[PDB]
Amino acid sequence: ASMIVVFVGTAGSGKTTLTGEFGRYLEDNYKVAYVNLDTGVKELPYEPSIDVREFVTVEEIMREGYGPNGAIVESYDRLMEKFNEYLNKILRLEKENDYVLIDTPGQMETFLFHEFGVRLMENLPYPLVVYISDPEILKKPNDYCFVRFFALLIDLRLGATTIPALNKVDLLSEEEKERHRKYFEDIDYLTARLKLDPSMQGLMAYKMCSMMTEVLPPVRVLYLSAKTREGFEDLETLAYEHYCTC
Amino acid sequence: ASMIVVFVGTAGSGKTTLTGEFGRYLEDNYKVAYVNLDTGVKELPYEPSIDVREFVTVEEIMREGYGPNGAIVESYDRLMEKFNEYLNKILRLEKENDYVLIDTPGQMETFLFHEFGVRLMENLPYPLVVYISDPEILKKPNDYCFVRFFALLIDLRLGATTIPALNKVDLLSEEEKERHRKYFEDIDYLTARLKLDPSMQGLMAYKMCSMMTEVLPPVRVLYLSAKTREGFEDLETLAYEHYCTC
Ligand SMILES: Nc1nc2c(ncn2[C@@H]2O[C@H](COP(=O)(O)OP(=O)(O)O)[C@@H](O)[C@H]2O)c(=O)[nH]1
Ligand SMILES: Nc1nc2c(ncn2[C@@H]2O[C@H](COP(=O)(O)OP(=O)(O)O)[C@@H](O)[C@H]2O)c(=O)[nH]1
């Protein structure tokens, strides 16, 4: 049919921007759709073909009673109702578009723990998942293993090739933006330093890693910058290369 | 010092209730504190010794500008400021209490992705983590592996023995509440049925499991019911048994 990319990434990871900034760069050579599944956001750098707000806004479920966490859960419980509609709504978008950029809710776990997100994922035609991570949590070894495991988690949960990605690599350094790569592209040295950590964690973080030594093909980490179109091109390849594979 | 229990569990898992309902049952024989780290909730079945709201309410960061996901992130960015205070505030609670029940934010990933939650965890004296899961997502094999991996994730991220737990086992069946146990206490049959799934996922969900065959001690799943005090007693043992071990 055509390529679909789901941007999953925790609150404040700046994925929405990326979601928009990637599309406009893709509107130069490709026809682009824009699905927003987030029920709680103010603006959008983009014009959604599909918007969950038109049905329901967290802001609403507020002026009704619930608080934040409770509103969120109700929105996606009210969505699992306009579901089979809302689904098809994304397929009829497939065959009139080259890329289709899906923008999952800020509460990653919303999309991740509640049928609305999982199911929608089963119904999509081999979607690629780009797991945006914010580089300001990569400080110590575990953190690297932590983020990469979770990414695999997502892959597992959502059943869809999931790509680890660092965001906002502009606000990076020089060697820093390569230190990160030492704990990434290279999957061996990460485990190497984990073996050094004599602490309980270090034990199972280390033991955890070897998720490669055992089994589960390496995977390539994407470095991206919404603002300065960093690694944007590569997303495309991967997109195609995955779209091909499957 | 004394026992501290952190309840982590995704939105709508009904942990806050459990957090309160467990304490009042513990107020019968133990002196109990009550820390609420959630900046976005309406009421609380309990009287917090500590409340993050007194500093800042999501509701506020709303009537200022931000929306849901943006408010949340700002609250915990404003907390990493009253941090070293707010910390100590929990230690001076240690040595005047038997149990101390910590109530993490609904957006699990808030507590999980942003320093406020991680750091606070390092500063606590061997806290036990009870990962509440809602049984209405356990439908197919993966789901079981999914929830148990994530639990281990949490353990890893937060560095603290993490206990998988199903919630609301009252709204359960008979054999259902034992089917669940087949995919749990028994860690072998879960992998057994995963090997049956000839799908891509089944491959790495199966491959994933063997997180025991390889290495990482079994762990016991808790069945809990806020309302009907189910498995409440066991929490205690574990609490003590862990408090002892370390
Ligand atoms: N410097 C920089 N800032 C970014 C980048 N991506 C997003 N941002 C900032 O973060 C905001 C986007 O947040 P948003 O995408 O809505 O958060 P999320 O969708 O919940 O993950 C933008 O207004 C930008 O100012 C980036 O690559 N570099
Ligand atoms: N039947 C049943 N309902 C529960 C249980 N625990 C919580 N609830 C319901 O869920 C609500 C609690 O939600 P809450 O704890 O605030 O959600 P969370 O803290 O974000 O995970 C309560 O008002 C109960 O009605 C349980 O064990 N059994």
Domain boundaries, chain A: 3-246
CB A46 within 8 A of CB A130: no
Helix axes B115-122, B141-158, angle to 10 degrees: 70
Displacement of CA B218 from its chain's centroid (Å): 18
Q: Nearest to residue B102, comparing CAs of B84, B86, B115?
A: B86
Residue A134 Rama label (left phi>0; alpha psi -120 to 50; beta): beta
- Helix (H, G, I), strand (E, B), or coil: what is residue B193? helix
Which residues of chain B make contact with A65, given a CB cutoff of 8 A?
42
d(C-alpha B132, C-alpha B9), whole Å: 5
d(C-alpha B150, C-alpha B163), whole Å: 11
d(C-alpha A167, C-alpha A135), whole Å: 6
* Total count of residues recorded for chain A: 246
d(C-alpha B150, C-alpha A154), whole Å: 10
CB contact under 8 A, B149 and A156: yes
The CB of B22 under 6 Å from ligand 2? The reply is no
Residue among A11, A72, A216 whose CB faces B11 most closely: A72
d(C-alpha A106, C-alpha B240), whole Å: 37
**C-alpha distance from residue B189 to each of A122, B192, B195 (Å):** 25, 5, 10
d(C-alpha B165, C-alpha B129), whole Å: 10
What DSSP line would sit under chain A, residue for residue?
--EEEEEE--TTS-HHHHHHHHHHHHTTTS-EEEEE--TT-S--SS--SEESTTT--HHHHHHHS--HHHHHHHHHHHHTTSHHHHHHHHHTTGGG-SEEEEE--SSHHHHHHSHHHHHHHHTSSS-EEEEEE-GGG--SHHHHHHHHHHHHHHHHHHTS-EEEEE---TT--SSHHHHHHHTTTS-HHHHHHHTT--SHHHHHHHHHS-TTTSSS----PEE-BTTTTBTHHHHHHHHHHHHHH-
Displacement of CA B134 from its chain's centroid (Å): 11
d(C-alpha B114, C-alpha B143), whole Å: 26
**Token output for A198:** 């004599």
CB B85 within 8 A of CB A57: no
Which residues lie across from B4 on neighbouring strands? B100
Q: Is the dihedral of CA B140, B145, B151, B156 positive or negative?
A: negative
Q: What number does the ligand 1 atom closest to the CA of B70 have? A: 20
| DSSP letter, residue B200 | H
What DSSP line would sit under A212-238, residue for residue?
TTSSS----PEE-BTTTTBTHHHHHHH
Residue nearest to atom 25 of ligand 2 (CA): B14
Mutation pick for ligand 1 pocket among B69, B72, B76, B113 (CB with most ligand atoms within 8 Å): B69
d(C-alpha B191, C-alpha B208), whole Å: 9
Which residues lie across from A6 on neighbouring strands? A102, A129
CB B159 within 8 A of CB B126: no
- Helix (H, G, I), strand (E, B), or coil: what is residue B236? helix
Burial B50-66 (b: 16+ CB within 10 A, else e): bbbbeebbbbebbeeeb
Q: Is the dihedral of CA A189, A190, A194, A195 positive or negative?
A: negative
d(C-alpha A159, C-alpha B208), whole Å: 13
Contacts of B29 (CB under 8 A, 6+ apart): none
Helices (H), chain B: 15-26, 58-64, 68-79, 83-91, 108-113, 115-122, 141-158, 176-182, 188-194, 200-208, 232-245
CB A213 within 8 A of CB A187: no
What DSSP line would sit under B121-145, residue for residue?
HHTSSS-EEEEEE-GGG--SHHHHH
Q: At which residue do the structure tokens 């500008």 appear?
A: B65
CB A169 within 8 A of CB A224: yes
**Token output for B173:** 């069946």
Q: Nearest to residue B131, comparing CAs of B167, B156, B169, B165?
A: B165
**Token output for B25:** 């049952």
B72/A contact by beta carbon, under 8 A: yes
Residue A158: closest C-alpha in chain B = B201
d(C-alpha A219, C-alpha A150), whole Å: 13
- Helix (H, G, I), strand (E, B), or coil: what is residue B104? coil
**Token output for B54:** 């007194």
- Helix (H, G, I), strand (E, B), or coil: what is residue B45? coil
CB A238 within 8 A of CB A165: no
B136, HSE (Cβ side, Cα atoms, 13 Å): 11
Q: Give the residues surrounding ligand 1 with Cβ less than 6 Å away.
A: A 9, 11-18, 106, 167-168, 170-171, 225-227; B 69
d(C-alpha B59, C-alpha A164), whole Å: 33
Burial of A122 (0-12, 13-18, 19+ CB in 10 A): exposed
Architecture category of domain A3-246 in CATH: 3-Layer(aba) Sandwich (3.40)
Interface size, chain A vs chain B, as Cβ–Cβ contacts under 8 Å = 145
d(C-alpha A39, C-alpha A50), whole Å: 12
| DSSP letter, residue B98 | S
E strand or H helix at B229, and its extent? none
**Token output for A6:** 């789901």
* Total count of residues recorded for chain B: 246
Q: At which residue do the structure tokens 């061996």 appear?
A: A188
Backbone angles phi, psi at A8, to 5 degrees: -105, 145
Contacts of A184 (CB under 8 A, 6+ apart): A144, A148, A164, A190, A221
CB contact under 8 A, A155 and B207: no
Q: Nearest to residue A129, comparing CAs of A32, A222, A208?
A: A222
**C-alpha distance from residue B90 to each of A219, B29, B246 (Å):** 41, 21, 19
Long-range contacts of B227-230 (CB under 8 A, 24+ apart): B227/B21, B227/B170, B228/B170, B229/B21, B229/B25, B230/B169, B230/B170
